[PDB]
Symmetry: C6
Subunit: 141 residues, 6 copies
């Protein structure tokens, strides 16, 4: 019945994980000892908060659509999946570009934060497959 | 009706925060004895005026939608949220590139106005999402 | 009636300012001996002419939508505002990049002409807000 | 009156100007052989042929919509105007970048070809205003 | 009905020329003697295969729309013309950038492959112009 | 009725290849000998996981739109083909840039991986083009 309970629980946990990415990348921006690391970290912080805002947005489009046509919600989740995956890909290319131009002493710690950013927004786009599949099996039957 | 009071009270304070950013980043352009920090500052000025105006545009579409279909406003505000978050990310990414390419003496003061510009254009998203989800609450409860 | 008149009187002056700011950056390009300053000045000429002409296109998109209702104009004008704001901020960001990469001896002329571009931004975006305030009042107050 | 055939009877001369820009820039591609100039010339060749293809595509679309109403012609033609203006401004930006990074001996002749592409832009945008505004008169009649 | 007997024969030779570009550029990738020329050639390979996939998509979108009327195909083919022209112009611009960045010893054969992409572009855009005209002369004239 | 079998069989193999090619690039991300190669590896990883997810999104959009007719899938899958192919082309372009700017000592392993990314999206080029061939056969041939 209320598929929105799953989507909104996912969304508000995604918001809190976005606010933990905020506190985590801001506390790293308070801990870290290079301005080029602080720039990449805080930038990745908001480039990832934008990814949590993307999953928020896609979960709001579904939560509005499933009140009248659930197959339009599934499609909105999928259109958001590819769009948030493009945001992952563009972020990954961007961060590969800064890893090439950045000086060696700030490549090392940055490669991990590139990694963890890529882990968060990669897990997000794959999570949308799991969120829509229960609606997929319920209209592909 | 009721949601428009929140939406448009938010909007015109978002406009005057656009005017305070206009005056604050212009006054920084009158104080700052660096053409490269002046370039960063006025471009952060128009990225933030464009950000406030993105909230103005999507708040005007929400308010004009609320006279006929609140679920259209909810969805339009969500489409505006992700788009404004991408605009935040694009500045926060590109200005992390300028923080690498710039000469050292204009990295230090630039890292602060990178910060304050990112705070202003990022917190704006947390505003827009807190507004739109009242329509999610209203339709589900 | 009144919306198209105000849009079209705005348009005609926006078209004359398109042609005149073009003739201004062309006659500046007749004085300015540096090829890099002429490239910047005439490219500012294009991206500003394109913004003026795009405000014409957004005023014509309103005039075409007005045959359905004023609310079709209000929304399409606002979608033109945010698109113009993005195009403006991307222009200012581009110029804030060229002002770093350009040799020091040609940074001063950039510091005015990216400035006059930012003045045309500050005018153009609020120029749509001012008629959105009217269309909001007429539809929704 | 003539709109469905008129647009396409400017367009076919815009196709011949597409082919005459093609032959002019391909002849220039051996009149001025130097690799970076030939690259900029043939790039301006296809970035202008893409602009003539844009006007061709806009002039096919705007006419084809006219079976519904004149509002469909004016909206599609104008959405092509702004989109062609943006594509032209992006060209003016990227050309203004190559004009910095290219070595001096290939800046001089390139500044003119940047110029003639920018003239063809300045013609095209005012052309799209002049081809449209009969259907603008149809919305004050 | 009859329009697709042209359009699908065109499409399948566009697919074979996609696979034949996918043999000539793919063979060149192990027949050439520089990794930067391999990068430019095989990347031009997919940038051109994406063009044959674009013309494939535009011809499948006609064939699907044609069950309603030819006027849907004419519009989709024109929408694909300008949209493929942008992707083509972005190719020539982008690879003119790599052709500045490349050292002189790998500019020479690279200039020619930029050339052959510009030939395939010129063919493709004049292609969609010829393909819609038999619908234009019938329904539009 | 039947077509969601062919779609979701292709999809689940595309998801498994998403995770397995992800495990290929994650194993490489702790067995490759340079941070720049690991950055290219992980980015080639998520730019392919995003490509696999693009095909997942197009396969969900087909299988959901199939409740109207297979012609909605043909159109959606084709709209997905062009943008997925363009995403591989933009990857191959930006990776031709990193492969030019990176020093020789990190060009060698990178010369395979840009190729293996180019090959692997060929599964998605074919995997959509084959189902476009069947969906075109199904309408009238």
């Amino acid at each position: 019945a209320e598929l929105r309970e799953r989507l909104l629980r996912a969304a508000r946990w995604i918001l809190l994980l976005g606010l933990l990415v905020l506190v985590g990348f801001v506390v790293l921006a308070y801990l870290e000892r290079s301005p080029l690391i602080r720039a990449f970290v805080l930038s990745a912080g908001v480039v990832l908060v934008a990814l949590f805002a993307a999953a928020l947005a896609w979960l709001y489009l579904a939560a509005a659509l499933l009140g009248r046509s659930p197959l339009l919600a599934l499609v909105a989740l999928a259109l958001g999946l590819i769009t948030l995956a493009a945001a992952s890909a563009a972020m990954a290319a961007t961060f590969a570009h800064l890893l090439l131009e950045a000086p060696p002493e700030y490549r090392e710690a940055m490669l991990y934060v590139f990694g963890i950013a890529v882990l968060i927004v990669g897990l997000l786009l794959l999570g949308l497959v799991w969120l829509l599949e229960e609606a997929l099996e319920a209209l592909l039957e």
